[PDB]
Amino acid sequence: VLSEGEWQLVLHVWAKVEADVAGHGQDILIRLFKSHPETLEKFDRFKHLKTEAEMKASEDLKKHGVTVLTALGAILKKKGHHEAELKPLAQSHATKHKIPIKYLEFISEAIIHVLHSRHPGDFGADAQGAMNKALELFRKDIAAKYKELGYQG
Numbered sequence: 001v002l003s004e005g006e007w008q009l010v011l012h013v014w015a016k017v018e019a020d021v022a023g024h025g026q027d028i029l030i031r032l033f034k035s036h037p038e039t040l041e042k043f044d045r046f047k048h049l050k051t052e053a054e055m056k057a058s059e060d061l062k063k064h065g066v067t068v069l070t071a072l073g074a075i076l077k078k079k080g081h082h083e084a085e086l087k088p089l090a091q092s093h094a095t096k097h098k099i100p101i102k103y104l105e106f107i108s109e110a111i112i113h114v115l116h117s118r119h120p121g122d123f124g125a126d127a128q129g130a131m132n133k134a135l136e137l138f139r140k141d142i143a144a145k146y147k148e149l150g151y152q153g
């Protein structure tokens with residue numbers, strides 16, 4: 001469970017992200033696909049992209065980045081009381097998109113790195129630890145739903 005002070009750190013930096021949701025979404029998905037190329041292969045929508053320049057030129061990738069970060073921001077602003085938001089996301093990620101929990105660990109690392117590059121004065125070590133706790137809680141609660149449905153591994 002995060003404390004109130006840890007939530008304030010998370011949401012203080014997230015309010016900065018929301019000034020440029022689309023740029024953050026591009027940076028995060030690009031980092032995920034470059035650092036873990038097995039993730040790109042899960043997207044029939046993006047697996048034609050073969051260079052970082054092609055990724056940065058894709059308007060559809062930039063649109064989906066906004067879809068992903070809008071869904072994460074709605075979860076973070078619930079401060080843990082996010083059951084209604086995780087149900088459909090776990091259901092689609094486990095049963096339709098076939099995304100292992102481990103790949104949610106990878107996108108979490110990408111989100112932390114991009115928040116650190118873009119917001120250093122609001123993403124010191126205290127806020128890095130609190131965001132890592134928030135992203136752990138997201139993964140823990142999704143993994144419980146995966147396990148229900150037979151997909152934890």
Ligand code: HEM
Pocket residue numbers: 039040042043044045067068069071072088089092093097099103104107
């Ligand atoms: C912070 C973690 C993530 C969030 C909030 C998120 C959010 C979303 C949302 C809101 C959608 C569209 C609605 C739906 O299908 O449920 C979606 C689609 C999808 N996501 Fe994620 N997702 C995350 C992580 C990942 C990861 C790590 C992967 C793959 C490595 C992935 C693969 C997919 C795929 C393949 C689609 C369908 C794209 C399409 O063809 O339209 N997701 N995601």
